[PDB]
Amino acid sequence: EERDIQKNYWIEHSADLTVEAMMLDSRASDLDKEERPEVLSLLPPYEGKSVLELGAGIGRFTGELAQKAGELIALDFIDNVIKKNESINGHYKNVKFMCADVTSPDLKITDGSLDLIFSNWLLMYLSDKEVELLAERMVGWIKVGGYIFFRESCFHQSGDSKRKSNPTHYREPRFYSKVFQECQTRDAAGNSFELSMIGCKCIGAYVKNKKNQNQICWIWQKVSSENDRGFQRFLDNVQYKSSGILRYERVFGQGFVSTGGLETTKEFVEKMNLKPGQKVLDVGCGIGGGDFYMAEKFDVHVVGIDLSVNMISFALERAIGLSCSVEFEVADCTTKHYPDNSFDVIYSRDTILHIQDKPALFRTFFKWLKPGGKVLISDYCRSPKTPSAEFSEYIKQRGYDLHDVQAYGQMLKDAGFTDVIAEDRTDQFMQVLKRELDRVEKEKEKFISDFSKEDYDDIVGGWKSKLERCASDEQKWGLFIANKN
Ligand SMILES: Nc1ncnc2c1ncn2[C@@H]1O[C@H](CSCC[C@H](N)C(=O)O)[C@@H](O)[C@H]1O
Ligand SMILES: Nc1ncnc2c1ncn2[C@@H]1O[C@H](CSCC[C@H](N)C(=O)O)[C@@H](O)[C@H]1O
Ligand SMILES: C[N+](C)(C)CCOP(=O)(O)O
Ligand SMILES: C[N+](C)(C)CCOP(=O)(O)O
């Protein structure tokens, strides 16, 4: 049924075979004039390379692409439309034209043959499943080092034209970020590949003309993928499933997934003495609230990494249109490489409990920090006492690696850091837990409506259990600060 309703929409809106008919907007001409060159300027390098254009239409871009590309395939599922394209651009000897549906089980494209797959409005005309299947196909079609560009209306309809029916999917940007980042291929020799997100941004011509930032494009590059992705999947499927992230955010505060939300962030960031132009690495950046805060308040550049595809998908969505200097990447902090002496500050909030080999991580932090730089970490810890049975079960289910506060400080000293401060902030942690829990209980009706009774009970139960384990001299919270001399 999806194929029928989507094709019928394009049969109707292709009948006139004009740019205006495609644009579905009263200011089609001016939008085209301003946005066409912008899209072209955003494409990754493809001169002399092999390009596939999906949903080419009557050919707004096809002619331009043909002038640069070594080889071009222009594809559309409306035969009349691709015929019109060919009537105009067929004189380019390097262009092949196809009438095909990108979702077809019979569509044949040779794996590892393409340098760029380009579309501009396409995935919004596919079902969720169709997008997932096509994304995986696309990763196979491009060579390692090749690129994918796509652009969609997100959130809601952009154009002002009257439409009797409309099957378009207006998605949140995080859907596209997640689906493409989740793709994985493996060749017959056993080598694994995935995409790296090169850029994601809104189209300026539409911000200027339509006063909204819903026209969003993505650029991805196919790269070698050497790490097993099992732990990433555990994060995205269990503790940090999207609903888990959103319910945690409700408790902790907008933009945060850890202790105290903005309040603790303001307190800890102050200790950094951030100066304009400095560069901060945020290890475990989550949904980005602390990064936006540092960048906006202090005029620093923040490099944020997080292993969770869900987390980064949220962060990239929330970063759209912002003037502050932040970049986000899906990466494992235990395998990621940076040059020595890259960062003024390394910052991490309640993330390193997920890391099993902290000494190895801290030795890397020592290298990555500039001389004179600072490391600031908050993290879950334990008493030097042996954990109770209940505390041990919590630790096991979460997969946490917990140490006592003194020992954690010692690991920083052993990694080479100077003037290590290791503060037991468990009393503050308990005060924060109570405030967070009291707010949830007070706003119970709104919480259950937005989430569920189960979600509410999970959060209330989890916070009460933390209060108990903290009161009982078991679970701890530490703040650690040190310098590289
Ligand atoms: N499943 C599908 N397979 C192939 N083409 C499709 C398709 N779904 C939509 N299309 C085509 O995608 C185009 C979207 S309109 C944009 C056309 C062009 N990318 C440009 O920006 O000018 C339409 O021409 C439509 O017919
Ligand atoms: N090996 C690893 N590399 C990078 N991030 C990791 C990681 N292991 C766990 N994480 C991330 O650690 C984060 C903890 S949640 C806290 C996020 C943010 N610092 C905030 O305070 O709001 C999760 O988003 C999780 O995906
Ligand atoms: C221009 N276009 C019609 C192909 C894409 C935008 O669609 P819409 O957001 O107006 O529904
Ligand atoms: C660890 N965290 C603060 C990032 C998220 C919450 O974990 P938990 O307190 O539910 O175990």
From Swiss-Prot:
It is an enzyme of class 2 (transferase). It comes from the Eukaryota. Gene3D superfamilies: Vaccinia Virus protein VP39. Highly expressed in the meristem and elongation zones of the root. Expressed in differentiated root epidermal cells. Highly expressed in leaf vasculature. N-methylethanolamine phosphate binds at residues 239-240, 248, 380, 394, 398-400, 466. InterPro entries: Methyltranfer_dom, Methyltransf_25, Phosphoethanolamine_N-MeTrfase, SAM-dependent_MTases_sf. It catalyses: phosphoethanolamine + S-adenosyl-L-methionine = N-methylethanolamine phosphate + S-adenosyl-L-homocysteine + H(+); N-methylethanolamine phosphate + S-adenosyl-L-methionine = N,N-dimethylethanolamine phosphate + S-adenosyl-L-homocysteine + H(+); N,N-dimethylethanolamine phosphate + S-adenosyl-L-methionine = phosphocholine + S-adenosyl-L-homocysteine + H(+). Phosphocholine binds at residues 153, 158-159, 163, 170, 248, 380, 394, 398, 400, 466. S-adenosyl-L-homocysteine binds at residues 55, 60, 76, 101-102, 120, 257-258, 284, 306, 332-333, 349. Its main location: cytoplasm. One of its GO terms (cellular component) is cytoplasm. Pathway: Phospholipid metabolism; phosphatidylcholine biosynthesis; phosphocholine from phosphoethanolamine: step 1/1. Its EC number is 2.1.1.103. Pfam families: Methyltransf_25, Methyltransf_31. PROSITE patterns: SAM_PEAMT (PS51582). PANTHER family: PHOSPHOETHANOLAMINE METHYLTRANSFERASE, PHOSPHOETHANOLAMINE METHYLTRANSFERASE ISOFORM X1. Involved in phosphocholine biosynthesis. Catalyzes the N-methylation of phosphoethanolamine, phosphomonomethylethanolamine and phosphodimethylethanolamine, the three methylation steps required to convert phosphoethanolamine to phosphocholine (PC). Required for root system development and epidermal cell integrity through its role in choline and phospholipid metabolism. In association with NMT3, regulates PC homeostasis, phase transition at the shoot apex, coordinated organ development, and fertility. Belongs to the class I-like SAM-binding methyltransferase superfamily. PEAMT family. This is Phosphoethanolamine N-methyltransferase 1.
